[PDB]
Structure 1
Amino acid sequence: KIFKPEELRQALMPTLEALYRQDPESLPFRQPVDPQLLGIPDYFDIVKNPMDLSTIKRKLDTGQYQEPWQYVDDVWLMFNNAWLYNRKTSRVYKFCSKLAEVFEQEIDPVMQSLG
């Protein structure tokens, strides 16, 4: 049950790269949400634990995931936050749904492998 951080990064980065490759859908998720810049002062009231692709990448890069379910949980936290805050007609919401479709296909074989 022990995963070296470098091993995790090698196995999990391609799944992250798949999400980054999605244009236009990944662009709202490439950086943390800035509520002041975006003019959405209630964002941190609704979303208690922000997450985005840049933070997930940094966590992979700095060895902050002890095991792979932590990585999957952060990706899903990103998705759930967007589905929670944004209305169903918004680009972010629909883009989130696309990323989730792309992620589920990428992650299955990798998680089976890592076990």
Structure 2
Amino acid sequence: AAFKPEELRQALMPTLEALYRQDPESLPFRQPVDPQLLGIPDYFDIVKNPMDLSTIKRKLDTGQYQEPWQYVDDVWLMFNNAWLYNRKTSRVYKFCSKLAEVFEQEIDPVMQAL
């Protein structure tokens, strides 16, 4: 099937907005990780393929996804990176887990519909 950018944005943007609405939990995910600002220069030794909400938002806004599993893949990549890098008891790991819980709840019915 061919998916138009407007269809994807209408269907998928509410699921992205649901992540942004989580406060405080979305705060570490709203911009690309900046290891120098954050004082964690080993970050890219661990995380090879960075992703964050702003990047995903821009891709949706500008029609860069052809089909919805591409969007799902980027959201999951963002979560997977944070679970890999951050320690289990850390704030940012737990914030990731909250976003992932919200995302699965939102995305399941949307993908069923398309």
The 2-side partners of 1:40 and 1:6 are apart by 38
Displacement of 1:48 = 0.8
1:13-51 CA distance string (max 9 Å, x none) = 000000000011000001110011111111111111100
1:44-84 CA distance string (max 9 Å, x none) = 11111100111100010111111000000000000000000
The 2-side partners of 1:46 and 1:5 are apart by 33
DSSP-derived class of the 2:48 partner: coil
1:32 paired residue number: 32
2:67 paired residue number: 67
* Superposition TM-score, scaled by structure 2 size: 0.96
The root-mean-square deviation of aligned C-alpha atoms, in Å, is: 0.6
Displacement of 1:107 = 0.3
DSSP-derived class of the 1:15 partner: helix
DSSP-derived class of the 1:14 partner: helix
1:16 paired residue number: 16
Structure 1 runs of 4+ aligned residues shifted over 4 Å read none
DSSP-derived class of the 1:25 partner: coil
DSSP-derived class of the 1:37 partner: helix
The 2-side partners of 1:60 and 1:87 are apart by 30
Q: Percent of aligned positions with the same letter in both sequences?
A: 99
The 2-side partners of 1:81 and 1:42 are apart by 13
* Superposition TM-score, scaled by structure 1 size: 0.95
Specify every segment of 5 or more residues in structure 1 that has no aligned partner in the other structure, as ranges: none
Q: How many residues align?
A: 112
The 2-side partners of 1:90 and 1:31 are apart by 19
